[PDB]
Design a protein around this ligand. Structure first.
Ligand SMILES: NC(=O)C1=CN([C@@H]2O[C@H](COP(=O)(O)OP(=O)(O)OC[C@H]3O[C@@H](n4cnc5c(N)ncnc54)[C@H](OP(=O)(O)O)[C@@H]3O)[C@@H](O)[C@H]2O)C=CC1
Ligand SMILES: NC(=O)C1=CN([C@@H]2O[C@H](COP(=O)(O)OP(=O)(O)OC[C@H]3O[C@@H](n4cnc5c(N)ncnc54)[C@H](OP(=O)(O)O)[C@@H]3O)[C@@H](O)[C@H]2O)C=CC1
Ligand SMILES: NC(=O)C1=CN([C@@H]2O[C@H](COP(=O)(O)OP(=O)(O)OC[C@H]3O[C@@H](n4cnc5c(N)ncnc54)[C@H](OP(=O)(O)O)[C@@H]3O)[C@@H](O)[C@H]2O)C=CC1
Ligand SMILES: NC(=O)C1=CN([C@@H]2O[C@H](COP(=O)(O)OP(=O)(O)OC[C@H]3O[C@@H](n4cnc5c(N)ncnc54)[C@H](OP(=O)(O)O)[C@@H]3O)[C@@H](O)[C@H]2O)C=CC1
Ligand SMILES: O=C1CCc2cccc3c2N1CC3
Ligand SMILES: O=C1CCc2cccc3c2N1CC3
Ligand SMILES: O=C1CCc2cccc3c2N1CC3
Ligand SMILES: O=C1CCc2cccc3c2N1CC3
Lengths: 272, 272, 281, 281
């Protein structure tokens, strides 16, 4: 019985046709591209957002235009009650849930000496606690054989980024969550993995990329990209949202069936 | 220029149509399935073998039957001259090389006190040195934007397998090779990664699976599979060659473009 | 080509003494959180035996904390206890202010206080998640913050992680494991910032260690271990979790902490030190 | 429910002495490969200072080896040099037999000998690969094998790795890095086997350390570093590779080796200990 092949042989194993995915914080940035790409691959997508209402509506319309159904659901991951409600709403929209991408997140910088309890809590509540409860509700609502992909960062393991303990720590915790949740969620045949991107061009990158660059405060946007391209990748280019979306789709497919409890680094070979 | 999208948006990014791949030790086991699956996804495949002539010929025929071209080439990876010859022959057969899967390998068990220089050398010459020179020749012959996938094992990082220092060490070195080669080979835009499978049902698994099981010398083949399924995976099943082939195809496609210098564990969440 | 042969420069200066004196903690002052019992208690005891004056922090175990202080004094060192709950930042701030007043300085800070929890991810409540993270992660973070502010230049900060931070086979453990996993990242990041005061920051990651905590939940780490006797539990821990065939003890951890706290640990910073007798979990 | 409260059992026995004596190496015998110079020389020197009688192995540096032996004796401990090339298994076997004849027993073995190499993967020849792997990997493996056979019950085996085993940004370094990365796996796997004689097996992973090797190739780790003066190279190493802002020294590694070799390292086995001042390479 253990000789049975799981899923189809050939390219069909990469297909996401007919699947239903939910992506947190899909109104913009990496989450937006995850939504777009899952859609291009045949998924109906639930676009979650907390603040970016108009942007979320635009993503939903873009997904439909590409040939897949989509809908948006407002929910703040810092509020568990919101997460619970979002999932209940989500399953009524398309009738089921096959894939959940926990992507929502915020960044923070500051020397450990200057960190306040309020800032620590702000970051942990969204990045760690928020992902945990999105994971909890995903387990309850996911189809047998489903998928849960959490959002980490190269910072979980990075050794040279100063004034970054809070954000880095909020992300490192996700790697442990993946290993432990992969055990529990396997009782519904759900795989649990964490993607760990390097710097990726989004609103977050624009806001804080210079903080990762010694003496980079006065660099132009052009110099910033040149630095990210040369310093963080032997491939000599900047990371883009699609670079992450592609890996998420692999994990979400039958091709990622034997990949569970893992951290997948997607940083172009960066050393940080 | 840093805003340019690398490759196609959508499912086409997972396509291997028109690519040419070379797989070492493709006459049987994991290498055979890699060759078969790469062929199913559109690759013309060079089926390398060292001893399994008839099996290699069967794989080539099956690939052609499935709709793709293939050819087998003999080469013992323990002889660098053989590796050099194989790559020269490969490019003559198909004109180019896009993907190289360094798969060939041998297993070994023995308490450290009993390991002989001959056994150590036998294992390292094939598993470590062999992979290193297959990688060197791959770099020389690969198309710009090519792919190199090396074969590691859960043993590179495993913490409870006794009498296994030689084999485990030969595989652990591969993880470092992936990180270092990713830097060098990036000058030709080639990504370099290592897949690390847990136990997979093959001839190798049949020969030594019991060695990974305390007091498993007398277990029936049925009990061995049951042990592997329950002990090594929360998903409760045994790993199969297709589980690995699928991940190799992902890495070999445009979807794996930003994944370089990484170790991808494919063990169903095993703890060993 | 730069042909000049190697030369002794300013970077050739030896940090600290050569020989066994490099392992000495004589004259140092250490603060250990949750030192009234368990691993924290042994850290305090051993640090005391090696010459440190110790600040024994406790949150509830008042009597045990007084016992530890008395034992350290009896052994030949000075000690004092300070009550503070790490789930309250104001308590941590006050603890450190009182601490430096006691002996005049702080050389070593061992962030040890913690709580354990088990539960399938599906059953975890926000209150339980918060209970664990507030003590194990947030608590250690602010103990670290205050430690940085009060520590002598060249000081030492040792955080308490666990084998669970990296463990792959413990079911129903994501909350506790995640709270400890975050500590490994903190060690790497804090080692950078705190180096501006020449302070090293590392995290010790113990496997199972015989304490009140181990007593309470060791069976949770053992498949079908609910009905195992205390003796059977120890035998299991000894054989299953260590090729060395014995159970981990508080002294096993305290010894490594003393190494990191000494001059011998000067070049070890931003690291995770596993102390589990070679366990695979 | 098992209601019997925690009590002492056979597994509660304290391994070794409580207090500072646990760090003592007094009366121990240690063997260090490649101890005529560099890191190996300092391991031998420091081990000697802490009370060990030392077997100083060398392959070529005869005079240097003799100087180390004389210095250890002058410092108060006995020592003797033994010539053996780790690329020849027969030499290794002979070296261990001679070592036990000299001092009667062997408590600690430090596998330190190594060579470095640089080259883009495209240019690496089988001879170069074999040259590096025969000494750094195969050599260390057979030194470990013989060490297991001759070491005292409760002994110590410390292998020499490098930050390169895990490094992510050093170009043209696959061969050397790989030869060192294999050592980390060896530590995990040998810790299991060797535990049958209560021997702990660990690997130390240094960052750049000022020695003849560092002097020879440090510029290779520095982009556009070919024309930097010796002073400039040290300044770069100090600032780029450590938040602590100084260069790593042989004594930095020797101290950690002494800790691992002592009773304090008793519960530390199958581990990789990074000693690089918090470097990111
Ligand atoms: N960009 C980079 O370089 C990297 C990013 N990451 C991680 O990837 C994820 C996305 O990053 P990126 O796209 O750059 O981020 P942006 O800052 O561009 O936006 C991120 C998303 O997080 C959402 N979000 C924030 N708070 C909440 C909340 N309370 N509830 C629900 N959703 C929320 C935002 O939605 P809204 O508009 O509605 O507020 C937005 O959709 C994050 O978790 C980030 O930490 C990891 C590595 C690198
Ligand atoms: N099965 C498992 O559980 C796991 C396997 N792996 C690794 O995956 C790879 C394949 O494993 P698996 O299929 O199980 O192995 P098998 O033993 O079934 O077959 C292995 C392959 O290695 C080839 N090979 C052996 N020696 C040479 C040589 N000198 N030159 C060229 N090719 C050679 C063999 O070809 P030929 O017949 O022609 O000699 C064969 O094709 C190996 O590297 C293995 O270590 C890693 C983790 C787990
Ligand atoms: N035992 C084991 O096997 C392992 C333990 N660890 C970690 O080591 C540390 C100590 O474990 P162990 O000694 O076994 O634990 P115990 O349960 O025996 O007691 C731990 C200590 O934590 C203290 N503490 C708890 N909450 C607080 C608080 N809010 N404020 C201040 N102090 C507090 C307790 O003091 P009080 O009585 O005053 O409340 C007690 O002194 C923990 O962080 C634990 O997670 C890691 C790996 C293994
Ligand atoms: N210096 C650094 O920055 C770092 C060094 N390391 C590792 O630490 C170890 C020592 O480095 P370092 O002291 O700088 O090296 P050096 O080049 O200064 O000398 C190293 C030692 O290796 C010995 N050796 C070389 N070949 C053999 C052989 N075939 N048989 C026996 N002994 C041999 C040499 O002895 P002889 O003179 O007799 O030939 C010498 O004693 C090496 O394994 C190295 O890879 C790791 C990280 C960093
Ligand atoms: O999480 C990371 C990791 C690395 C990195 C480099 C540049 C800019 C940004 C990042 N982020 C968020 C924004
Ligand atoms: O390399 C590994 C890892 C794990 C494992 C489990 C069972 C059988 C076999 C393995 N192998 C080879 C054969
Ligand atoms: O944190 C850990 C890791 C391993 C372990 C094994 C047994 C008992 C206990 C543990 N703990 C806490 C109590
Ligand atoms: O092995 C390593 C790692 C790092 C490093 C930095 C500088 C100089 C040298 C090293 N070596 C050998 C010589």
């Amino acid at each position: 019985k253990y000789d049975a092949i799981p899923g189809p042989l050939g390219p069909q194993s990469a297909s996401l046709e007919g699947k239903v995915a939910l992506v947190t914080g899909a109104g913009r940035g990496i989450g937006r591209e995850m939504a777009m790409e899952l859609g291009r691959r045949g998924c109906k997508v639930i676009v979650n957002y907390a603040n970016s209402t108009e942007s979320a509506e635009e993503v939903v319309a873009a997904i439909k235009k590409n040939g897949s159904d989509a809908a948006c659901v407002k929910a703040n991951v810092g509020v568990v009650e919101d997460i619970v409600r979002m999932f209940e709403e989500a399953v009524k929209i398309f009738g089921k849930l096959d894939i959940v991408c926990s992507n929502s997140g915020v960044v923070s910088f500051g020397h450990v000496k200057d960190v306040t309890p309020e800032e620590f809590d702000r970051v942990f509540t969204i990045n760690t606690r928020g992902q945990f409860f999105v994971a909890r509700e995903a387990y309850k609502h996911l189809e047998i054989g489903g998928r849960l992909i959490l959002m980490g960062s190269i910072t979980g393991q990075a050794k040279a980024v100063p004034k970054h303990a809070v954000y880095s720590g909020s992300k490192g915790a996700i790697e442990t969550f993946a290993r432990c949740m992969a055990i529990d969620m396997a009782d519904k045949k759900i795989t649990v993995n964490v993607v760990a991107p390097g710097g990726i061009k989004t609103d977050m990158y624009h806001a804080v990329c210079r903080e990762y660059i010694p003496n980079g405060e006065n660099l132009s946007n052009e110099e910033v990209d040149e630095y990210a391209a040369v310093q963080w990748s032997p491939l000599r280019r900047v990371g883009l949202p699609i670079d992450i979306a592609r890996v998420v789709c692999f994990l979400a497919s039958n091709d990622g069936g034997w990949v569970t409890g893992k951290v997948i680094g997607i940083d172009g070979g960066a050393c940080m």
